[PDB]
Design a protein around this ligand. Structure first.
Ligand SMILES: CCCCCCCCCCCCCCCC(=O)O
Ligand SMILES: [Pr+3]
Length: 228
């Protein structure tokens, strides 16, 4: 679609509208970084690993009734990439698409003396999410409220069906910096369950996956535009 002609409630500009440019806030040495097949696979791998693990009723969290295996979405990734060119985590841009009406978004920031390889930037984001296992609770799962839990909680939403990420790195303030942004097909909704509870893992899947045995397969007809 032409994002300039896809409106959104609130009437904010769409992140995809117009020609790409680096924000002045990126300083004068920004570079958008291509996430290659190996990177995309790793992101998916870790997201699906944690979903499968939580789905079994791990970490004291409830068993998940219908948690689907997540796929990579090129459109979401393209919008995430465009977002990173602003070098700012939170903005008020719209980022809706025709298939995904209210995409979720995570932003991972890095600042350090040296710039890590792309794989280390991804590992750092994963670690951050993983460490949130000490913050998330059965209560949060039953009734979403946003230490931090946003990143891990979005990864295990059973409304989420797809993810796509992008990355820009730059130099400012005597530091190497990065912004890794991941857009998801859905968002958690304040006051609603992160995922639906089951007595057994995938007890409500039309079909369970053979690889991530506690999740629904990739063809599970989950509507990402509905909440719990
Ligand atoms: C690029 C980051 C994607 C979004 C955040 C990722 C969510 C955390 C992933 C953690 C993976 C670890 C899951 C395995 C659970 C276990 O074996 O204990
Ligand atoms: Pr390519």
């Amino acid at each position: 679609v032409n994002y300039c002609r896809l409106p959104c409630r609130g009437d904010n500009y769409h992140v995809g509208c117009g020609e790409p440019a680096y924000a002045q806030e990126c300083g004068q040495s920004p570079r958008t970084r291509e996430l290659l097949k190996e990177h995309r696979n790793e992101i998916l791998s870790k997201i699906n690993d944690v979903r499968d693990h939580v789905a079994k009723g791990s970490w004291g969290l409830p068993v998940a009734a219908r948690m689907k295996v997540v796929v990579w979405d090129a459109e979401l990734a393209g919008l995430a990439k465009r977002h990173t060119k602003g070098c700012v985590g939170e903005t008020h841009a719209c980022r809706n698409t025709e298939r995904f009406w209210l995409p979720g978004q995570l932003n991972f920031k890095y600042s350090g003396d040296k710039l890590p390889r792309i794989k280390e930037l991804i590992d750092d984001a994963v670690k951050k999410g993983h460490l949130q296992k000490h913050n998330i609770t059965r209560e949060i799962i039953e009734n979403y409220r946003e230490g931090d839990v946003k990143e891990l909680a979005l990864a295990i939403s059973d409304r989420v069906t797809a993810v796509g990420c992008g990355l820009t790195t730059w130099e400012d303030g005597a530091k190497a910096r990065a912004l890794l942004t991941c857009n998801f097909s859905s968002q958690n909704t304040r006051g609603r369950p992160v995922y639906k509870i089951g007595n057994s893992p995938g007890e409500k899947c039309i079909e369970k996956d053979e690889t991530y045995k506690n999740l629904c397969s990739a063809t599970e007809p989950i509507d990402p535009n509905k909440s719990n």
